[PDB]
Amino acid sequence: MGPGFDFAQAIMKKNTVIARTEKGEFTMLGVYDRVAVIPTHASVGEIIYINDVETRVLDACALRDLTDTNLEITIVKLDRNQKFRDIRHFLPRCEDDYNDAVLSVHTSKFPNMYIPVGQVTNYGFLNLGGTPTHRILMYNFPTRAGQCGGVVTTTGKVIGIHVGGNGAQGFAAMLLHSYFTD
């Protein structure tokens, strides 16, 4: 509808796949080469389904900060025959607050879905389903199940992936440039 949804649409059309684990279907952001991200609570194993194709997982890493605290981001390398568009230059280098964010989801259940979530707070510490979690972004949208993995963008930046909510607010794990330095 406007330049926010334009940027979000550009990311969704080239840099997302539908990931299926034993914990369900997720939006999964491809970042560069065969490297993608997903909420750690997806519990990625040896094999994953990518757009309903059985795919071997070459590597999976559950990120923790240097305090040894959960970040809820799993970096996954896929045994796929095709590379993602490199979007590492759209990742912010620092933790920050942002205005006018969009949350974008694509699954079987929620295809071509885009939500204007508005202002995004650098929230920091969250007890997420009982797990101490750091580097959390918060937006005042009553987000629901099916939306985890969803991509949080501003015009020009990909800032995080949706990992939960409480019925009033939604929560995203920050993406930072430094996670994907090869």
Count of β-strands: 12
SSE ordering: HEEEEEEEEEEEE
The strands making up the biggest β-sheet line up spatially as 1-2-3-6-5-4
Percentage of β-strand residues: over 45%
Global Rg = 15 Å
Instruction: Tell me the overall shape.
Output: globular
Q: What number of domains?
A: 2
Number of helices: 1
Distance N to C terminus: 36 Å
Plain-language structure description:
With 182 residues, the chain is mostly beta strands. The strands form two sheets. It has a six-stranded antiparallel beta barrel. β11 and β12 form a beta hairpin. The chain is globular. It is found in: Host cytoplasm.
Topology:
Layout: H1 3-15, E1 16-21, E2 24-32, E3 35-39, E4 47-50, E5 53-64, E6 70-78, E7 98-105, E8 113-128, E9 131-139, E10 151-154, E11 157-165, E12 170-174
Antiparallel strand pairs: 1-2, 1-4, 2-3, 3-6, 4-5, 5-6, 7-8, 7-10, 8-9, 9-12, 10-11, 11-12
Subunit structure: Interacts with host IFIH1/MDA5; this interaction inhibits host IFIH1.
Subcellular location: Host cytoplasm
Domain Peptidase C3: 2-180
